[PDB]
Nucleic acid binder design. Structure first.
Ligand code: K
Ligand code: K
Ligand code: K
Ligand code: MG
Ligand code: MG
Ligand code: MG
Ligand code: MG
Ligand code: MG
Ligand code: MG
Ligand code: MG
Ligand code: MG
Ligand code: MG
Ligand code: MG
Ligand code: MG
Ligand code: MG
Ligand code: MG
Ligand code: MG
Ligand code: MG
Ligand code: MG
Ligand code: MG
Ligand code: MG
Ligand code: MG
Ligand code: MG
Ligand code: MG
Ligand code: MG
Ligand code: MG
Ligand code: MG
Ligand code: MG
Ligand code: MG
Ligand code: MG
Ligand code: MG
Ligand code: MG
Lengths: 129, 139, 98, 149
RNA sequence: UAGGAUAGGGGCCUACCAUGGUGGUGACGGGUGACGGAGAAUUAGGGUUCGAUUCCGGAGAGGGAGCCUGAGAAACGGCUACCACAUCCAAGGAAGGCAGCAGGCGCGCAAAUUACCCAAUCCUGACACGGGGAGGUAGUGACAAUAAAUAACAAUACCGGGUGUCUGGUAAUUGGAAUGAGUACAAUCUAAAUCCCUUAACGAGGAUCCAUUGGAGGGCAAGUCUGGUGCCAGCAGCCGCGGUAAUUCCAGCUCCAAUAGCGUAUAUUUAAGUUGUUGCAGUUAAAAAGCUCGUAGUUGGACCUUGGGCCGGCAUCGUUACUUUGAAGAAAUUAGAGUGCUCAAAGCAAGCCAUCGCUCUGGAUACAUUAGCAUGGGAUAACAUCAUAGGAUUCCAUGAGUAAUGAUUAAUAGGGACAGUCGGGGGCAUUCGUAUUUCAUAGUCAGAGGUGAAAUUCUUGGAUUUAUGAAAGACGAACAACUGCGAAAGCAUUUGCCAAGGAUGUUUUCAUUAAUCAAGAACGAAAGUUGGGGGCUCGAAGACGAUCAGAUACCGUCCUAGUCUCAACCAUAAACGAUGCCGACCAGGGAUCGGCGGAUGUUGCAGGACUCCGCCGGCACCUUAUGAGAAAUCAAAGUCUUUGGGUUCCGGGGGGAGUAUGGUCGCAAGGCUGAAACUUAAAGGAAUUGAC
C-alpha cells in the first residue's frame, strides 16, 4: 500500500527527470511534499509547480529545468542532532561544496545548512543534489 | 527484503544473532569444540616420543615424510608430529622429551603430508634448529 | 541454461493440461507440448486414381478424402523428420513453412 | 487489491466536484427526510435507500440536498438498525454458506470461502468494537447466528 | 490482617485468610575455559574481540556451619564442631591453615631474591619519638616501550658525468685528527650502598672494539652463478619443485628485506561489502515456504497559523517519542593547552632579576552511549479522547439565558449493497457417445497374433475376420487455441438444483475498517495405508519367450497389488515462471479474453452476428535500450557505491548430510525440526575456440 507519499513523489520526479521530461505529475499531494518542493525550488533545483485541487487529495504539476541530478527520501526518518549533520553529509552527499539534506525540525522543514544556522536538529526527510 | 522499520530493532538483532551461526569461523569459535582438540586451546604442548614413523607423501608428490608418533603428557592423546630439516629424525630417539607446535593452518593438514597438523619444535629441551645448525648438542 | 522462453510447451495461465499418447510409441506427452499435425490425403494415390476411375461404376462418384490429426512426442517427431533441429537464431522463428 | 483475492479491479463511482446540489433539484429537506424515514420504516437500508432516492425521486446525492449522510439522518431520527449494514450482509452470506455446506460435506471449495467470509466478519466486528459501534460483549456465534438474521 | 524478630522496612518468620505471581517483549531451565565497571587492541565511519591484574564495587581465607569480643566481623596472621589433608609425641595427649612477602613441591607451553630500609607516600598506637614483606630500594628481566654506537675526513691508485678542467664513486692503500663501549682516581647519587649525570689517568686500523635474523620461481625485494643429490633426501603457509643440465632441496659466492632486532605456534582485529543497520545475497552459482487464511510483531493516504506587523502575585493543565540548552556528573586512560626532562617515550613541572625574592607561577579544556532531573521548540510520529450533550460561558468564613451552538472530505486504499453479464471454478442428482471386453445368434474356412526377425500364446471342438443385439466398467477424440476459470493442487458430454467468485457499470453506502505476517489453521497431483463395492483396459511384483559374452532390462504374451468409487489416514513433486505478497514510476506496437461507451452499414434474423474508435481488468506476444546483469537474458530480473517505499521466508566454499540423536505428527511407508567428528582446494554458473 501507499506507505510514504513523499517517496512516490520524489521517485516519480526523479524518473521523469532522468528521461528528460519538462513536466511531471505527482499524486497524491500533501503539505510535507509542498514544503520539500519549496525548499528545492528556493535553492534553484526545480522551477514552477502548481497544486491542483481535486477535492480529495490534490495533485502537483512540477516544471523541471534539468538541474536536478538525484533526489530521494530516507526511510525510516532517523533522528539527527546538530552534531550528527556532518556525518550524514559525508554519507548522502557527493561533496562538501554543494548538495542538500532536508530536515523536518520543530522550526519547520528546512535544509541542513539552515538547521546549522539556527542550531536546531530533527528528523531526516530526504536529500537532493 | 530487509525490515527497515524504526520499531524493528529486535527483529534485526535477533535475525543477525540467528544467522551468525552459518559462519564457519564464528561457529568454530563459539561451539566450544576447540577444547576437545589434543592441544586444548594451547599454542604448544609437550610429549613423549612413542615411535618414529614415515608417511608417504600424497600424490602427485613422491617422498617419505619422517614423522613421529608421540603422546601428550597433559591429556594422554596420541598424535603424529612432523620432523623437518633433513637428518633431524636421527636426533629423536625412543621415549624422548619433545615440545610440539601447530603446523600453521590452525588445525588443518599442511602440504602433501596426509593428516599431519603438528611439527616437532624441541627435543630433550633443545631446539631442532640449534641441533640442525650444530649450534647445540643433544644432552 | 534456458533453451526456450516457453519451455518447449504452450502453457500460460493454467497449471494442468491432460496428456495424449504419441501415435508411434504411445508415450504420454502433454497436449500442448506434443507435435500435432493434420494430414489430409486421398484414399488412393495418383498411380491408383487412374485405375480406379474407369473401375468406378458411375462417373459422378467423387473420390473420398481422409483426414487424420496425429500427435508425436518430441523424440518420435525428431526421429521421423517431422521437425528438425534448427539454429539458435532460427529457433525463435515460429512462422510455418510456406 | 482485493483483500481475499488476486483481483485488481478499480471500478467505482466518481462524485462530482460541485458539492452544491444541482439547480433543477426542487425538493425541500423535509420531503427527503420524510422519504428516508418512511423507507427505513419499510425495512430498507442506507445503501439501498440511496439508490431508491437517486432513481425514483431524482436526488443525486443525499449529503448534498440535506447536508448530512443517510446513516447520520437515521441515527438522529433513531431509526438506525442495531447492526451495521455491511456486517449484517456478511453474516447473512455466512449463514447461507453454512446452510448449504451442511448437506454437502464434500464441497471442499465452499469450506474455503466460508473460512474467508468468517475472517472478514471477525475483522469487521473487531473494527466496530474498537469504535464502540457494537457492545463490547458482542460475539459471532455460528450456531445462533442464523437467528439474528 | 495481627504479632514475633531485627538497628530498622519487608513472608524476614509465625497463626488465620484469599488464589494469586512470571512468560514468544523468551519467564523457567541449561552453558560459560563468566567476578562487574572505569577501560584494552584494532579502528574512514559504523563495528568486532577482550576486560584474572595495581582505581571503584563485590566475594573468599582448604570445604561447609555456628559464634564471642567489639562502635564496626558471621573476622579465619580469632574461637567451636564435622569432613579432607597434614605436624611432632615419652603414644596419655598437643598444635594446624602462604589466594601476605620471599622460598619449595607439583601442575604445566608458561612467570624473578628464602636481599636492604622505614629515607619517601601514608596508616596505626597512650604516641613529635614505636611499628609497618603496606610502601620504597637494590637483584633477575629482549613482556612491552624511548633515544641511540658499530666509524667521519683528506691524499694517492682506479673508474664515471657536466682534448681540457671540475664533480662523483671504490681500494685488509697512505695519513692524521674525533669519540665512547671499557677501566678508574674523585666527587656526586643513596637511609647505607649501587646505576645514571660529571670527571683525573689509560682506552681503536683488518679501528678482531669482528651484527644478526629470514630469504633469492610467483604472490613478494633479491641468481635462469658454481659444486652435490637424482620423484631419493628434502623444500613447500597456497600454486608447486626434485625422475643426470634443479633459478625452489644440500652447500660456496653474490644479492635482497628489517636491523639490535628478526623467525615460528596459537588466540583475534583488519583485510571481510565472506554477517552487510551504514552495506551482501535468493531465475540458472547456495539460497522464495505447494498454496491461502491468521493472532502477536513490524508498517500504515490526505486534512486543522496564516497573513502581522514589530523585530512578588493567581490560578489549573493531554501523555510521550524527537530536538536545543542546563545541571549533576571519580581519578587514571583517550583527545588536548602550557612547559627545551640535552631529544623522545615521559613528568606536572617550572621561569626570571642574579633577589635574604618575585611571577596571586601553573597544575587548562573537551568527550563521556543509554536511563534519570530541569528549560525552550511543536515540524514529523504513537495513545485514547470525537454526536444520547452528561459540552463551554452567565444570571437565578475572619429555572431563564447563551452562541455561526458542536459531525474534515469521501483515497485510480478497503469493505458492503445493487444491475446486466462471464467462466472446461465447486457439490449433488441426471443424460449421451463411440471404442474395449464378455456373452448370445448367424456366415465362411486356415491360419491368426506380435516382431528389425522370431518364439512363448490362440486355433478344423472353428482361431483371426464379418453382421446383429445385450451387459459391464473406464474413458469424454475431433472442436482445443502462445484461449478460459481457480489460492494452489486442478478443472473439458447434456440438463436441473444449490451456494460461491472475478471484472465491468454506478452522482449507492460505511469511513481507515489496511499490507505482510511467529504461534495456530483450511485445501494439497501421483504413488502409498485401513475397510466396503466394482473390477473393462492398462499394469509395479511374479512367470515365460526373445536378444546378448552375460540380461533379474530395453522388445512379445499372461497377469497380482494398483488404475474407478465411498468413509477415513499421509502431506510430499522439476508442487517451476526453478522469479513471495502489497504500492508508485519508467518505451513503443499489434493481437486476444470479459465488461462498458461511441460511430458505423450489412444480415433468409431494439437487440444478436460482423466492421471501426476508446476505457478498465487479465493471459500472453513482438521490436528496442537510453536501463540492468558474470552472461544467458529481463519491459521487469529497470528506477543500486548517485546504495533506504512496507513486510514475511530464507543462503554463507564443496562433502559428511537432510545423515546421527533427541522432540513431535502418522496404523505403517514416512513427514516437520535437525548436528558433530573427520575430509577437501577447489565444487560450481554463463559464454568462447577446438575435439568428438
Ligand atoms: K510443441
Ligand atoms: K525488619
Ligand atoms: K573497640
Ligand atoms: Mg543442455
Ligand atoms: Mg488466472
Ligand atoms: Mg504442475
Ligand atoms: Mg509487621
Ligand atoms: Mg505460614
Ligand atoms: Mg569463574
Ligand atoms: Mg575485572
Ligand atoms: Mg598478581
Ligand atoms: Mg579490588
Ligand atoms: Mg570475609
Ligand atoms: Mg590453598
Ligand atoms: Mg570464617
Ligand atoms: Mg596466612
Ligand atoms: Mg585477613
Ligand atoms: Mg616469561
Ligand atoms: Mg640457495
Ligand atoms: Mg621479484
Ligand atoms: Mg645445479
Ligand atoms: Mg555474499
Ligand atoms: Mg544446479
Ligand atoms: Mg539453485
Ligand atoms: Mg512459488
Ligand atoms: Mg500520515
Ligand atoms: Mg467430447
Ligand atoms: Mg474457452
Ligand atoms: Mg506457520
Ligand atoms: Mg520441497
Ligand atoms: Mg473486447
Ligand atoms: Mg557450506
Amino acid at each position: 500500500v501507499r506507505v510514504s507519499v513523499l517517496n512516490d513523489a520524489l521517485k516519480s520526479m526523479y524518473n521523469a527527470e532522468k528521461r528528460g521530461k519538462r513536466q511531471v505529475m505527482i499524486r497524491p499531494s500533501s503539505k510535507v511534499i509542498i514544503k520539500f518542493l519549496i525548499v528545492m525550488q528556493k535553492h534553484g533545483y526545480i522551477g514552477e509547480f502548481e497544486y491542483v485541487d481535486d477535492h480529495r487529495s490534490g495533485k502537483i504539476v512540477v516544471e523541471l529545468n534539468g538541474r536536478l541530478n538525484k533526489c530521494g527520501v530516507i526511510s525510516p526518518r532517523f533522528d539527527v542532532g546538530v552534531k550528527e549533520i556532518e556525518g550524514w553529509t559525508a554519507r548522502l552527499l557527493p561533496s562538501r561544496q554543494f548538495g542538500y539534506i532536508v530536515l523536518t525540525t520543530s522550526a519547520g522543514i528546512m535544509d541542513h545548512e539552515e538547521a546549522r544556522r539556527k542550531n536546531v536538529g530533527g528528523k531526516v526527510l530526504g536529500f537532493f543534489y | 527484503g530487509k525490515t527497515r522499520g524504526m520499531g524493528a530493532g529486535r527483529k534485526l538483532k535477533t535475525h543477525r544473532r540467528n544467522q551468525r551461526w552459518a559462519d564457519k569461523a564464528y561457529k568454530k569459535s563459539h561451539l566450544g569444540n576447540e577444547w576437545k582438540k589434543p592441544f586444548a586451546g594451547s599454542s604448544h604442548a609437550k610429549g613423549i616420543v612413542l615411535e618414529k614413523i614415515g608417511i608417504e607423501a600424497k600424490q602427485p608428490n613422491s617422498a617419505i615424510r619422517k614423522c613421529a608418533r608421540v603422546q601428550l603428557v597433559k591429556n594422554g592423546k596420541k598424535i603424529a608430529a612432523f620432523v623437518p630439516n633433513d637428518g633431524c629424525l636421527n636426533f629423536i630417539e625412543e621415549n624422548d622429551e619433545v615440545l610440539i607446535a601447530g603446523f600453521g593452518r590452525k588445525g588443518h593438514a599442511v602440504g602433501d603430508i596426509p593428516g599431519v597438523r603438528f611439527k616437532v619444535v624441541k627435543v630433550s629441551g633443545v631446539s631442532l634448529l640449534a641441533l640442525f645448525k650444530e649450534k647445540k648438542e643433544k644432552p | 541454461t534456458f533453451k526456450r522462453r516457453n519451455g518447449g510447451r504452450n502453457k500460460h495461465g493454467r497449471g494442468h493440461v491432460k496428456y495424449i499418447r504419441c501415435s508411434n510409441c504411445a508415450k504420454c506427452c502433454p497436449k500442448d507440448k506434443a507435435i500435432k499435425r493434420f494430414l489430409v490425403r486421398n484414399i488412393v494415390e495418383q498411380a491408383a486414381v487412374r485405375d480406379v476411375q474407369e473401375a468406378c461404376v458411375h462417373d459422378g462418384y467423387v473420390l473420398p478424402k481422409l483426414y487424420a490429426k496425429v500427435h508425436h512426442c518430441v523424440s518420435c517427431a525428431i526421429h521421423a523428420h517431422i521437425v528438425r533441429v534448427r539454429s539458435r537464431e532460427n529457433r525463435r522463428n515460429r512462422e510455418p513453412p510456406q | 487489491g482485493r483483500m481475499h483475492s488476486r483481483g485488481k479491479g478499480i471500478s467505482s463511482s466518481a462524485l462530482p466536484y460541485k458539492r452544491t446540489p444541482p439547480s433543477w433539484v426542487k425538493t425541500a429537506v423535509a420531503d427527503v427526510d420524510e422519504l428516508i424515514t418512511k423507507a427505513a420504516k419499510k425495512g430498507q437500508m442506507p445503501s439501498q435507500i440511496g439508490v431508491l432516492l437517486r432513481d425514483q425521486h431524482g436526488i443525486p446525492l443525499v449529503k448534498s440536498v440535506t447536508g448530512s449522510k443517510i446513516l447520520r439522518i437515521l441515527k438522529a431520527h433513531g431509526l438506525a438498525p442495531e447492526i451495521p449494514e455491511d456486517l449484517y450482509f456478511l453474516i447473512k452470506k455466512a449463514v447461507a454458506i453454512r446452510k448449504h455446506l451442511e448437506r454437502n460435506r464434500k464441497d471442499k471449495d465452499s469450506k474455503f470461502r466460508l473460512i474467508l467470509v468468517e475472517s472478514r466478519i471477525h475483522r469487521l466486528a473487531r473494527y466496530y468494537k474498537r469504535t464502540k459501534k457494537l457492545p463490547p460483549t458482542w460475539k459471532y456465534e455460528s450456531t445462533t447466528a442464523s437467528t439474528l438474521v
